[PDB]
Amino acid sequence: QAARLRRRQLIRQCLERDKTPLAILFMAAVVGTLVGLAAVAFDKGVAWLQNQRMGALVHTADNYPLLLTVAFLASAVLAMFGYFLVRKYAPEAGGSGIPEIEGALEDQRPVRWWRVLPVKFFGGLGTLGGGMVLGREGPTVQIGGNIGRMVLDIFRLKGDEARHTLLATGAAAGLAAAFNAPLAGILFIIEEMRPQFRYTLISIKAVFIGVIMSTIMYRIFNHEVALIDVGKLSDAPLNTLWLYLILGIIFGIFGPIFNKWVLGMQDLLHRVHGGNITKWVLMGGAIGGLCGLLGFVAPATSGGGFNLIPIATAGNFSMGMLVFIFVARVITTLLCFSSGAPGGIFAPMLALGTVLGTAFGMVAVELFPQYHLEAGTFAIAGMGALLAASIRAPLTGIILVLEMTDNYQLILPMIITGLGATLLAQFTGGKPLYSAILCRTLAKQEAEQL
């Protein structure tokens, strides 16, 4: 009868009248509007700082050593301002911000929106606007989760189930308004933050509301159907689907290796400054100045990565250039993200999977000419395979790539590529990167409390 009283517990759940608090559902539309407006202002300010930087690199065009100095120095001072705001005011605004938000969903990290929200905005503005190899995905999730706490504090909402609802609403609205991906922002919460999020009928409807309001706030100011404008690539036949499983196996081995390089470079770059702010800022200007220098000479090795993925998905880079771009963008991704700059690793990971997927597709075309393959259809499957192998959230990584590229005929090749990425990353001993960063944040704050 151990299942009999369990069955009587099941019938006691059906006759419950599930109430509908419309107060938290209205604030989720206030959150999602404010997240989507702060996401648009972040993207328009990062792009304005990037167009002002290349506008300074064309007025000094005939003078080449002066151009390389003002490519370094305009990106160094822009990065030094971002490192200074994090180190002086909000140290939890360094890095991505997803481990700070999913640590807040466990009631383990504080949400200091009076400090993080001006520092993650303006410090990430000069960091990403300076041309560093960092994405706006992580900043927008942390700006979103801090806006949802701000709305909870301004309107004085009490209760701990409303606190986790509005914090997850803005993190869902942050992903939905960074990438024009309303489907991935919902799957950000129920698939990637699955151990963190408390699934209530109200809390998942509020995640839907904030995602809707932040996608509408995005599309008012951006009228393109694809964030990454690759074309309409070919279908994948059934006799070519095993090549996407092999491509996932290669990504699923590299994924844990890349995660050990992220945490290993976090430790190695911390020995340079030792926690000192005036050496953390000057190391951040040397890293930020290099990526603005690399933004002029060999610009495929620097930047967030979205200006490389449509070039690499088409057959424009050779096999020797994709090897150079991959090694250089592995070095500058670890140099930017693991140094504690405000900026995520998600959009640099898309450029690393596109280049590694195009390299796989170019070998697959020359090895199998009987399949009529494309190099670009493996770049899409490789894009969400490094998020499956390192971030270890394949479903919100697949959906995000299909929404950014508008290529939904590759759903089954991406699930095949994302399975072998997740299967071999668990097998080879890999953890999620945002979990591994948060577990090192939690073990550090357990050590200063001794």
- What are the binding residues? 96, 345-346, 434
Q: Is residue 347 a contact point for Cl ion (CB under 5 A)?
A: yes
Per CB under 8 A, the list member of 57, 70, 77, 190 interacting with its own copies is 190
**Position 349, amino acid:** M
Nearer to its own copies, 300 or 398 (CB): 398
- Beta-carbon count within 10 A of 320 CB: 8
Q: What are phi and psi of 135, to 5 degrees?
A: -110, 165
Task: Annotate 236-290 with DSSP letters as a single string.
Answer: --GGGHHHHHHHHHHHHHHHHHHHHHHHHHHHHHHHHHTT-HHHHHHHHHHHHHH
- Closer to its own copies by CB, 301 or 407: give it: 407
Q: List the single partner that 419 binds among Cl ion, its own copies, none, CB under 5 to 8 Å by kind.
A: its own copies
Q: Which 8-state DSSP code applies to residue 387? A: I
Residues 87-116 that bind its own copies (CB under 8 A): 106-108
159: left (phi over 0), alpha (psi -120 to 50) or beta: left
Rule CB under 5 A: is residue 346 a binding residue for Cl ion?
yes
Residue placing its CB nearer to its own copies in the complex, 283 or 410: 410
Q: Decide if residue 390 touches Cl ion (CB under 5 A).
A: no
Binding residues for chloride: 96, 345-346, 434
Residue entry with tokens 């195009």: 358
Per CB under 8 A, 325 contacts its own copies = no
Q: Report, in Å, the least distance between residue 205 CB and its own copies.
A: 6
Q: Counting contacts by CB under 8 A, is residue 35 touching its own copies?
A: no
140 touches 174 (CB < 8 A): yes
Radius of gyration of the chain (CA): 22
User: Please, what's the b/e burial string for 396-413 (b: 16 or more CB within 10 A of its CB; e: otherwise)?
Assistant: bbbbbbbbbbebeebeeb
Q: Which stretch binds its own copies (CB under 8 A): 6-14, 47-55, 92-100, 364-372?
A: 6-14
Provide CB contacts within 8 A for 402, sequence distance 6+: 408, 410, 411, 414
When the beta carbons of 65 and 429 are compared against its own copies, the nearer one is: 429
Residues, the chain, total?
450
Task: Specify the amino acid at residue 243.
Answer: L
Residues 230 to 289 in contact with Cl ion, rule: CB under 5 A:
none
Residues that bind its own copies (CB under 8 A): 3-4, 6-8, 10-11, 13-15, 17-18, 20, 25, 106-108, 182-183, 186-187, 190-191, 194, 199, 201-202, 205, 208-209, 211-212, 215-216, 219-220, 225, 235, 238, 241, 394-395, 398-399, 402-403, 406, 408-409, 411-412, 415-416, 418-419, 422-423, 426-427, 429, 431, 435-436, 439, 442-443, 445-446, 449
